Amino acid sequence: AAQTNAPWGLARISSTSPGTSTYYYDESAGQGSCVYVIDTGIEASHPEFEGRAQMVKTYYYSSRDGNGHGTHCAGTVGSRTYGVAKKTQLFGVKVLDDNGSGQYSTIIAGMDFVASDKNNRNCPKGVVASLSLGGGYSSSVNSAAARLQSSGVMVAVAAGNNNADARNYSPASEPSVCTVGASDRYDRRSSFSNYGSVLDIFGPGTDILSTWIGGSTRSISGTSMATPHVAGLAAYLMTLGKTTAASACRYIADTANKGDLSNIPFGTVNLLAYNNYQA
Ligand SMILES: [Ca+2]
Known part of the structure; x- marks a missing residue:
């Protein structure tokens, strides 16, 4: 399949080169997989989600995304126009309030919620969780992310937006998840x-x-936006049978574009997510 005039990031993850504008992908498009977006919620009624999104948990007085951030991330995972995996099932877990923040105790509970809740969902091709969130180092937050991964979920987490070593941030610093x-x-x-x-x-x-709340769209920036590209890619590859939840991060690293990026310091991988879709 080919989607012309796609967002540059979709075009990028299916290309061996920057500077193109068409997204190429196998039409299976993540069908039969599930992606949890652990964030401010998801505006599920948005047509862009086509009925494939649903809120399953909140820790606040409402499950509504009153911020937009979670809706944007979910859109990069799986919206029809802006998504990597255009047929995946999206599940929203609202651990962040409408100001975009959450207590670590709530974020931890949300991760353990996903590890159990996947047993209540139909995800024959596998389960992914996208965590565009984090703060300072916490062994408890890292151990929750490690449990979620161990339970059979492909966990993708944001590296953080501090222009610093991710070793000091959580869940970014948990070794066993996919840090983006x-x-x-x-x-x-x-x-x-x-x-x-x-x-x-x-x-x-x-x-x-x-996507954004109020049935809208916008462009924003962050490691929060990179993370759902990788989560959606994992779901897409798991539907194709190329990899599994336990192995998807390594598979993505193995098949990535190598050496394309600039200003990667020594000791950090130089690897850009790539779907290697070859019609
Ligand atoms: Ca890792």
Whole structure:
């Protein structure tokens, strides 16, 4: 399949080169997989989600996304126009309030919620969780992310936006999950992107067009935007049978574009997520 005039990041993850505008992907499009977006919620009624999104948990007085951030991330995972995996099932877990923040105790509970809740959902091709969130280092937050991964979920987490070593941030620093840095359309490391030995992969994160609340769209930037590119890619590859939840991060690293990015410090992987779709 080919989607012309796609957001640059979709075009980038199916290309061996920057500077193109068509997204190419196998039409299976993540069908039969599930992606949890652990964030401010998802505006499920948005037509872009086509009935494939649903809120399953909140820790606040409402499950509504009153911010937009979670809706944007979910759109990059799985919206029809702005999504990597255009047929996946999306599940929203609202651990972040409408100001975009959450207590670590709530975020931990949300991760353990996903590890159990997947047993209530039909995901024959596998389960992914996208965590565009984080703060300072916490062994408890990292151990929750490790449990979620161990339970059979492909966990993708944002590296963080501190232009610093991700070793000092959580869940970014948990070794066993897939820690995602951000790049721009000219294949630079995004100026704010964290780096370091714990990074597994980079994805598009500067000037990313996706869904927003009120049935809208907007472009924003962050490692929060790179993470759902990788989560959606994992779901897509798991539907194709190329990999599994336990192995998808390594598979994505193995098959990534190598050496394309600039300003990667020594000791950090130079790897940009790529679907290797070859019609
Ligand atoms: Ca890792």
